[PDB]
Amino acid sequence: GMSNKFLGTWKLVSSENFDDYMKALGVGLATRKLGNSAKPTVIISKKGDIITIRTESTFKNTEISFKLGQEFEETTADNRKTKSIVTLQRGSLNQVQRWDGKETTIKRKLVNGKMVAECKMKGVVCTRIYEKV
Numbered sequence: 001g002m003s004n005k006f007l008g009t010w011k012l013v014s015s016e017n018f019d020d021y022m023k024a025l026g027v028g029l030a031t032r033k034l035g036n037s038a039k040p041t042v043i044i045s046k047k048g049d050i051i052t053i054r055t056e057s058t059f060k061n062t063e064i065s066f067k068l069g070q071e072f073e074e075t076t077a078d079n080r081k082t083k084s085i086v087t088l089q090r091g092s093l094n095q096v097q098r099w100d101g102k103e104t105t106i107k108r109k110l111v112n113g114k115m116v117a118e119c120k121m122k123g124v125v126c127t128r129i130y131e132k133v
């Protein structure tokens with residue numbers, strides 16, 4: 001299953017193209033400004049076969065709990081109500097969110113002890129790097 005090397009608390013240290021990513025999602029300007037300013041913390045944890053990914057920022061906190069490969073209801077930070085599935089592919093945690101006939105993917109993998117999130121919406125690709133705290 002998911003490597004335990006994912007487990008822990010992670011701090012955003014880099015973001016690239018997040019603004020176009022948020023635009024692609026339909027996020028408005030004032031909200032994009034706060035999203036570009038945010039340096040969130042991501043806490044990954046597990047209890048049994050339930051994985052929890054919690055995101056904490058001054059603007060918005062979010063949290064999802066799921067079992068691999070089982071679709072669940074998610075409320076995103078920009079308040080989309082999505083049906084989502086997290087899968088494991090070559091050590092990459094891959095989240096797909098679907099709503100209103102659209103789809104975005106967030107792929108999280110470990111690289112030299114950092115966590116790299118790649119976010120994809122309509123060909124826009126955003127890259128966010130996190131360091132373990």
Ligand SMILES: CCCCCCCCCCCCCCCC(=O)O
Pocket residue numbers: 022025027031034035036038040042055057059060076077078106117119128
């Ligand atoms: C990310 C929380 C704070 C900013 C909230 C602004 C609303 C836009 C959210 C878009 C989806 C966020 C995807 C984040 C991917 C990651 O975990 O790095």
